[PDB]
Amino acid sequence: NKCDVVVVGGGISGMAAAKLLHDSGLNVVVLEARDRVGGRTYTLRNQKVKYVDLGGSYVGPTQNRILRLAKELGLETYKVNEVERLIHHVKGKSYPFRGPFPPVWNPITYLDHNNFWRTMDDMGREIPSDAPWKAPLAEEWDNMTMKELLDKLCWTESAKQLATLFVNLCVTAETHEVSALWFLWYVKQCGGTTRIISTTNGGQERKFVGGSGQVSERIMDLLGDRVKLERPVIYIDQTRENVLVETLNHEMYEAKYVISAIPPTLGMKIHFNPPLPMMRNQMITRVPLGSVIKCIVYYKEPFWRKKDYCGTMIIDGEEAPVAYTLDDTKPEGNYAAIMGFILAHKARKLARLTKEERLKKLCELYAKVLGSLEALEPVHYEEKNWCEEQYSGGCYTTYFPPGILTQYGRVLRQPVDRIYFAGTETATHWSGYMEGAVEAGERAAREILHAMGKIPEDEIWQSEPESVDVPAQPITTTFLERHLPSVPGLLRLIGLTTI
Amino acid sequence: NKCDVVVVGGGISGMAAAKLLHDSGLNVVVLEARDRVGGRTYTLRNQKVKYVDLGGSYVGPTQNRILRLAKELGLETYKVNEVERLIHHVKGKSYPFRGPFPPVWNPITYLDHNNFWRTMDDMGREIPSDAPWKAPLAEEWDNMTMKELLDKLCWTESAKQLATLFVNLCVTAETHEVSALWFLWYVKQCGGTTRIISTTNGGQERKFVGGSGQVSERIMDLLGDRVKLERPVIYIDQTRENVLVETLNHEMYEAKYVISAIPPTLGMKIHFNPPLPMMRNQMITRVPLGSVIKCIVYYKEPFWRKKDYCGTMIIDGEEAPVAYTLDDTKPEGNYAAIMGFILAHKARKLARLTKEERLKKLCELYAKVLGSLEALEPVHYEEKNWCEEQYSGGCYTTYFPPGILTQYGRVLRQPVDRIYFAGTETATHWSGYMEGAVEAGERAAREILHAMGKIPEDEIWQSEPESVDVPAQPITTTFLERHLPSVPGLLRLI
Numbered sequence: 004n005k006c007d008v009v010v011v012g013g014g015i016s017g018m019a020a021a022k023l024l025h026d027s028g029l030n031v032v033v034l035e036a037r038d039r040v041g042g043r044t045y046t047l048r049n050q051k052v053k054y055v056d057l058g059g060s061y062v063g064p065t066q067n068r069i070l071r072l073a074k075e076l077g078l079e080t081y082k083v084n085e086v087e088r089l090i091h092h093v094k095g096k097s098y099p100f101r102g103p104f105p106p107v108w109n110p111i112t113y114l115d116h117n118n119f120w121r122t123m124d125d126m127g128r129e130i131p132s133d134a135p136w137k138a139p140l141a142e143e144w145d146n147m148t149m150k151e152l153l154d155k156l157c158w159t160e161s162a163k164q165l166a167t168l169f170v171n172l173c174v175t176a177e178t179h180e181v182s183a184l185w186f187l188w189y190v191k192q193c194g195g196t197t198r199i200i201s202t203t204n205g206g207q208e209r210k211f212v213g214g215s216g217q218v219s220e221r222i223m224d225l226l227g228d229r230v231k232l233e234r235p236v237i238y239i240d241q242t243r244e245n246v247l248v249e250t251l252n253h254e255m256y257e258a259k260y261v262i263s264a265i266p267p268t269l270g271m272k273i274h275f276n277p278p279l280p281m282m283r284n285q286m287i288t289r290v291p292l293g294s295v296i297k298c299i300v301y302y303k304e305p306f307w308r309k310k311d312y313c314g315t316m317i318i319d320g321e322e323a324p325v326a327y328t329l330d331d332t333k334p335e336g337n338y339a340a341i342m343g344f345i346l347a348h349k350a351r352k353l354a355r356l357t358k359e360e361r362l363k364k365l366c367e368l369y370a371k372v373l374g375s376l377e378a379l380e381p382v383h384y385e386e387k388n389w390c391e392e393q394y395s396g397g398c399y400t401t402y403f404p405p406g407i408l409t410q411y412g413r414v415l416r417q418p419v420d421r422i423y424f425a426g427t428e429t430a431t432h433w434s435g436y437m438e439g440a441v442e443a444g445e446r447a448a449r450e451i452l453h454a455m456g457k458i459p460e461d462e463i464w465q466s467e468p469e470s471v472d473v474p475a476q477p478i479t480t481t482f483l484e485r486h487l488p489s490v491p492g493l494l495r496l497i498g499l500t501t502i
Numbered sequence: 503n504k505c506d507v508v509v510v511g512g513g514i515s516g517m518a519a520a521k522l523l524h525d526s527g528l529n530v531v532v533l534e535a536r537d538r539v540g541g542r543t544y545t546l547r548n549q550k551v552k553y554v555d556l557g558g559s560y561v562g563p564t565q566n567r568i569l570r571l572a573k574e575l576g577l578e579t580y581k582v583n584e585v586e587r588l589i590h591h592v593k594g595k596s597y598p599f600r601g602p603f604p605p606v607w608n609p610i611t612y613l614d615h616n617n618f619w620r621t622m623d624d625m626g627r628e629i630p631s632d633a634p635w636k637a638p639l640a641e642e643w644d645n646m647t648m649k650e651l652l653d654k655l656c657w658t659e660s661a662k663q664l665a666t667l668f669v670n671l672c673v674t675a676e677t678h679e680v681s682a683l684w685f686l687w688y689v690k691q692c693g694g695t696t697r698i699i700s701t702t703n704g705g706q707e708r709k710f711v712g713g714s715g716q717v718s719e720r721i722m723d724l725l726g727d728r729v730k731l732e733r734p735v736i737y738i739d740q741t742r743e744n745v746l747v748e749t750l751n752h753e754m755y756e757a758k759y760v761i762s763a764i765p766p767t768l769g770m771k772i773h774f775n776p777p778l779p780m781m782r783n784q785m786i787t788r789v790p791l792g793s794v795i796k797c798i799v800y801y802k803e804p805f806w807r808k809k810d811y812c813g814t815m816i817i818d819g820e821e822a823p824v825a826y827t828l829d830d831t832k833p834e835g836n837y838a839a840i841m842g843f844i845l846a847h848k849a850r851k852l853a854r855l856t857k858e859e860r861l862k863k864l865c866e867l868y869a870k871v872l873g874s875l876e877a878l879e880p881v882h883y884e885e886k887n888w889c890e891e892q893y894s895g896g897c898y899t900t901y902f903p904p905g906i907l908t909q910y911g912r913v914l915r916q917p918v919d920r921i922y923f924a925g926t927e928t929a930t931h932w933s934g935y936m937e938g939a940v941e942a943g944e945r946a947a948r949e950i951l952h953a954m955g956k957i958p959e960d961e962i963w964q965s966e967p968e969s970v971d972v973p974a975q976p977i978t979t980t981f982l983e984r985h986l987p988s989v990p991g992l993l994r995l996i
């Protein structure tokens with residue numbers, strides 16, 4: 004019935020918010036739609052897999068908040084396997100390699116690839132993390148799809164094909180669906196292209212021992228009965244002195260403030276009294292989440308390692324169901340598995356098939372890519388289509404179509420009376436990730452501690468001590484990388500020499 | 503409690519649907535979220551204006567369904583004033599003209615303008631009304647914004663800006679926000695460029711005496727207590743034998759079938775059990791409505807008519823709050839008024855101002871465009887900002903961003919078990935309009951009649967005889983208009 008703060012949503016962001024508010028001495032309630040906590044994280048446990056992350060999974064250096072929270076809850080990380088060679092599969096052939104980026108040999112193509120990555124990071128520096136709409140050319144770039152930007156930037160089909168896969172794989176959406184400004188922002192607020200695509204020294208370095216669902220579960224364990232499962236919030240009323248929050252099972256909750264810790268667009272499921280302001284009213288109809296199926300195929304052994312393949316595959320091609328894989332063998336070396344993502348329009352297309360038809364298509368793909376018949380001998384298959392989740396909307400996160408971030412962006416985390424906004428979408432560092440869920444959750448919580456006069460204004464946004472378990476190597480460039488010309492730059496050098 | 507069919511939404515679409523079902527002998531309830539019916543139509547009455555449509559208002563030839571329904575409810579139309587000259591205001595000067603399309607004098611610009619309009623209708627001829635995702639070039643056109651298309655097509659800044667205005671005005675969104683495929687479909691399913699922009703012999707030819715809101719009020723009058731106001735639906739359950747529909751005020755309604763007659767995205771305000779199929783679950787997050795403020799300034803007299811202006815203004819440029827006006831004077835010659843739309847980003851921007859501040863800006867603009875100090879002396883002002891409506895989400899209608907129509911368009915009017923889908927968005931002729939809303943409510947109702955055994959499959963989609971009161975004249979083109987080259991075509995001859 005009565006408390007200080009009601010948190011709507013029991014994902015990482017909600018549970019991080021509640022935990023901070025509870026640790027500070029307030030009475031909180033977490034209202035959670037599903038029969039479980041975790042949200043876009045979910046750890047399945049059976050005898051065939053022991054445990055497996057069907058949602059959010061990877062962490063890495065610079066993600067210091069999620070690592071501190073996980074460690075405070077008694078969790079440990081382990082390194083994803085990147086000992087052996089990565090594979091770049093393009094035009095029906097596999098090309099093994101080492102280091103984060105697939106190499107390229109053709110000099111024209113080398114210049115175009117170098118310039119693509121460099122330009123992403125170049126445009127990124129123009130874009131404030133905390134206010135993307137303030138970039139000097141915010142409008143010009145927001146009025147563009149990533150597709151249009153790649154049509155202008157990539158002078159080779161090789162670079163354009165790889166850039167297309169990068170977008171799809173990073174934001175589970177087509178290049179023609181997303182704003183260039185938004186995408187550039189998203190990449191920059193993760194710390195740049197190298198940080199986001201890397202396993203070693205980047206976003207995919209590590210997983211938690213026993214799965215990421217433990218984060219939410221263990222916070223629930225601290226909060227006891229304060230967490231209420233199967234409580235979909237339908238109604239928020241701010242007309243009176245106390246905020247009244249109504250659930251679908253006809254319960255009433257009464258509070259001083261509310262944290263909305265749900266994907267922006269899932270805000271549409273709540274009826275508001277009084278109505279939301281114009282700008283938030285339209286914003287939450289303009290921000291969908293991407294489309295992805297996560298698939299894990301299990302095998303007797305990690306046979307690929309024996310061929311000096313770490314199990315990372317970067318798979319270009321329309322025929323290919325999966326575009327990216329990682330090794331998902333346990334750190335012990337057992338329950339050998341390949342993890343892969345089916346992305347964007349391929350999630351739409353291939354969801355029409357049965358579980359068994361998807362397994363077959365993956366095994367056949369893996370067989371060709373790894374040059375192994377063993378890939379046709381799976382011992383188990385687990386999967387989750389995030390597109391069919393009423394209380395997620397999709398995965399990994401919310402993307403912004405063209406025109407939306409400059410017009411509506413500033414209201415994402417603008418409080419509405421005594422409603423405050425968390426969720427990873429509201430973060431300024433690794434928004435989209437579990438890291439961003441923790442940042443947004445703790446920031447939202449502290450916004451309320453300020454409103455209550457319990458902390459000063461400068462303690463709302465709090466920096467995070469670098470992890471001592473997972474320290475960050477800095478991102479370096481070479482002289483050549485920095486100064487080699489673009490393709491158009493070389494053409495200008497050719498027109499000038501011959502004059 | 504118990505009935506044959508629950509309709510969610512008491513806009514024109516819901517009401518048209520409920521009326522049809524009720525007339526055929528079924529017990530229908532209409533659940534409406536607001537304290538009124540009409541939805542994106544709303545007629546305000548006061549002594550100062552008498553009545554004024556603050557939402558959907560205009561009807562015209564080929565919109566035979568809204569005309570027939572309205573005629574049956576005892577409503578009549580009158581012609582929007584277009585006797586005198588239109589005005590195109592470009593680079594701070596007023597150019598009077600007659601006929602639907604503002605003229606062009608420079609030969610190059612001329613070729614370019616001619617090519618733009620012709621090209622929208624050519625592209626449209628390859629888009630099926632009932633299935634735009636089947637256009638031969640569906641994917642290629644769906645993956646561009648209308649900004650990209652206009653950048654390719656328009657060789658002059660003049661044509662690019664008039665085409666940008668055209669997009670902004672028709673679908674209340676920016677060229678860069680919308681799929682080219684969707685926009686081309688939209689125009690095509692209204693009968694082409696000429697039909698959609700024309701007052702005489704087009705979509706803006708007529709209004710309803712007493713206001714459009716009478717359509718819904720009078721259907722509510724016919725259904726009596728069967729319409730439940732302030733009943734926002736929150737929960738639809740199809741697990742059991744009958745469908746259970748729950749409202750925010752806690753009431754339980756039980757039925758054999760449901761019609762959802764709300765804008766697709768407002769589907770998100772409903773919790774479903776079992777959950778929605780994947781494709782609809784994502785669709786309803788990907789389909790916003792435009793942004794618009796409708797503004798009506800009242801004057802002592804229709805003074806513009808003294809200067810041989812009809813009150814139609816087409817106003818180029820960023821600085822103008824309003825890009826388009828019509829005469830909103832009553833047919834009797836009184837309650838003189840000018841109606842203007844503040845579109846898209848200008849709606850987001852100018853909404854921060856006060857009502858008085860908007861009125862001042864509009865009056866100063868009209869003074870300049872009409873070239874008259876009489877515009878500075880308004881006697882009254884009414885406006886509505888549809889962006890702020892929880893239960894509309896905007897106006898006029900839902901637009902499709904790049905990528906969505908081809909990927910999710912199929913799911914729009916596909917039944918989900920015992921839920922059938924109406925609303926103007928699901929129509930195939932004048933979707934987006936009150937005509938659309940009628941077509942879709944009556945279709946959705948007739949789908950339920952078929953599921954129930956009462957009518958054959960071939961009677962779900964019913965043609966409509968032409969209104970005798972509002973006949974359509976044919977759309978024609980000249981020989982020059984059809985065969986004059988584009989700018990690039992003139993250059994491939996040189």
Ligand SMILES: *[C]C1=C([C])[C]=C2C(=[C]1)N([C][C]([O])[C]([O])[C]([O])[C]OP([O])(=O)OP([O])(=O)O[C][C]1O[C](N3[C]=NC4=C3N=[C]N=C4[N])[C]([O])[C]1[O])C1=NC(=O)[N]C(=O)C1=N2[C]/[C]=[C]/N1[C][C][C]([C][C]C2=[C][C]=C([C]([C])[C])[C]=[C]2)[C][C]1
Pocket residue numbers: 011012013014015016017034035036037039040041042043044057058059060061062103104105168169172173199200201206207234235236237264265266269272273295296297317327389394395397398399400425426427428435436437438439440
């Ligand atoms: C789904 C997913 C997946 C599948 C995956 C992933 C993910 C996801 N992610 C994301 C995460 O998970 C997120 O972020 C989080 O979790 C979020 O959180 P929050 O914020 O908390 O939210 P949520 O969870 O959702 O929660 C919510 C809640 O609430 C509720 N509700 C609703 N409604 C309602 C409610 N309640 C009450 N009432 C109402 N009404 C619900 O239920 C819930 O509970 C992630 N993240 C991280 O961190 N990690 C990971 O891993 C993840 N994942 C992902 C991945 C990604 N990626 C990255 C990138 C990569 C790629 C790279 C590359 C590129 C390129 C290249 C070239 C070739 C060179 C390479 C590489 C991939 C991966």
Ligand SMILES: *[C]C1=C([C])[C]=C2C(=[C]1)N([C][C]([O])[C]([O])[C]([O])[C]OP([O])(=O)OP([O])(=O)O[C][C]1O[C](N3[C]=NC4=C3N=[C]N=C4[N])[C]([O])[C]1[O])C1=NC(=O)[N]C(=O)C1=N2[C]/[C]=[C]/N1[C][C][C]([C][C]C2=[C][C]=C([C]([C])[C])[C]=[C]2)[C][C]1
Pocket residue numbers: 510511512513514515516533534535536538539540541542543556557558559560561602603604667668671672698699700705706733734735736763764765768771772794795796816826888893894896897898899924925926927934935936937938939
């Ligand atoms: C808003 C608006 C405005 C402002 C305006 C307009 C409009 C609108 N429109 C549209 C209409 O209105 C529509 O379509 C209709 O109405 C719709 O219907 P429906 O479908 O039925 O829907 P609604 O109404 O929305 O309803 C729904 C209902 O539901 C409810 N709910 C929700 N949720 C819920 C519920 N319930 C229960 N539960 C739940 N959950 C609600 O409440 C409601 O009630 C229109 N239309 C027509 O027809 N007309 C008109 O007028 C209109 N308007 C408009 C405008 C138009 N435009 C056209 C075009 C023009 C332009 C021309 C031109 C262009 C260019 C040129 C150059 C320069 C050359 C020229 C010219 C403008 C105008």
